[PDB]
């Protein structure tokens, strides 16, 4: 089935959006962004999120997370979430409200609680990230030990993320 674009959402005409994807109001999909739900797996991108050029959202055929609307989703992106250039969000995945995912970083089969800041060239996999935690650039997080010991978002680090998107 087709995707649902909120009329109040701005989706570049050169972006590629395939399948059961839910684009909320005020959501900005940049040029060359790839969102693909060709498994019959639902995708939901919450309001006023920003997907930058080259970002990409894939989903596994099997696996889901629980959305805030009580539905099961392959991918649930919350509200005000930044997914930056060349970053990947794959498979069963949950990003909270006000999450940041830096350049060329991957979130796959994982839970990222709200307000979290993920930097650049990083992988988060197989973990439930606590709300409000910061993964450094280049980090590889696969054990729930590693998650538990993540720094909380320094009021500094959310400035860096607020510079990366400046609109």
């Amino acid at each position: 089935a087709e995707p649902y674009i909120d009329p109040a959402a701005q989706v570049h005409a050169i972006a590629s959006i395939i399948g059961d994807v839910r684009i909320a109001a005020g959501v900005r999909v940049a040029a060359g962004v790839s969102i693909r739900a060709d498994e019959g797996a639902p995708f939901q991108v919450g309001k006023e999120s920003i997907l930058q050029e080259g970002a990409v959202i894939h989903g596994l055929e099997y696996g889901r997370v629980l959305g805030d609307d009580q539905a099961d989703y392959s991918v649930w992106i919350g509200q005000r979430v930044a997914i930056t250039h060349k970053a990947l969000i794959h498979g069963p995945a949950y990003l909270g409200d006000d999450c940041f995912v830096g350049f060329r970083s991957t979130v796959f089969n994982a839970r990222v609680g709200a307000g979290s800041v993920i930097m650049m060239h990083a992988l988060v996999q197989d973990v439930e990230i606590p709300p409000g935690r910061y993964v450094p650039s280049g980090a590889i997080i696969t054990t729930q030990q590693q998650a538990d010991r993540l720094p909380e978002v320094r009021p500094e680090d959310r400035e860096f993320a607020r510079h990366i998107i400046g609109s």
């Binding site: 590629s16 060359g32 990409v56 250039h85 350049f103 650049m120 060239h121 650039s137 590889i140």
Partner: protein, 121 residues
């Protein structure tokens, strides 16, 4: 994971064309792979010199100034340049290099997966 193996995969193109948005001025002997994204904000421009090659999946995004790829510089697939950057004459950038407000000496070579990021110049 082996080196760069944690980084995202490198996806095929959908068109045989790349996409520019902003102020770009291109050199007749330049080779740009399909699906490369040259983006320049209103305060900004991208400048690519003679003999440059830009590989599959690369993204050049100029912000607060200019990105200048000088002549004979080469970018492997998925190189990402955000901010303002000058890539030296004859430079070579490994796959999935990231340069953020950082420049490259002429002839300098970047290991694949490299991450070079300064806050602001």
């Amino acid at each position: 994971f082996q080196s760069n193996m944690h980084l995202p995969p490198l996806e095929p193109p959908i068109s045989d064309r790349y996409f520019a948005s902003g102020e770009v001025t291109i050199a007749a002997d330049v080779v740009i792979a399909p699906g490369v994204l040259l983006i320049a904000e209103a305060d900004s421009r991208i400048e690519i010199a003679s003999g440059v090659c830009i590989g599959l999946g690369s993204v050049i995004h100029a912000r607060g100034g200019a990105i200048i790829i000088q002549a004979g510089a080469l970018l492997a697939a998925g190189v990402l340049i955000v901010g303002q950057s000058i890539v030296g004459r004859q430079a070579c950038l490994g796959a999935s290099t990231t340069l953020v407000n950082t420049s490259i000496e002429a002839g300098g070579v970047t290991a694949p997966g490299s991450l070079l990021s300064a806050e602001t110049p």
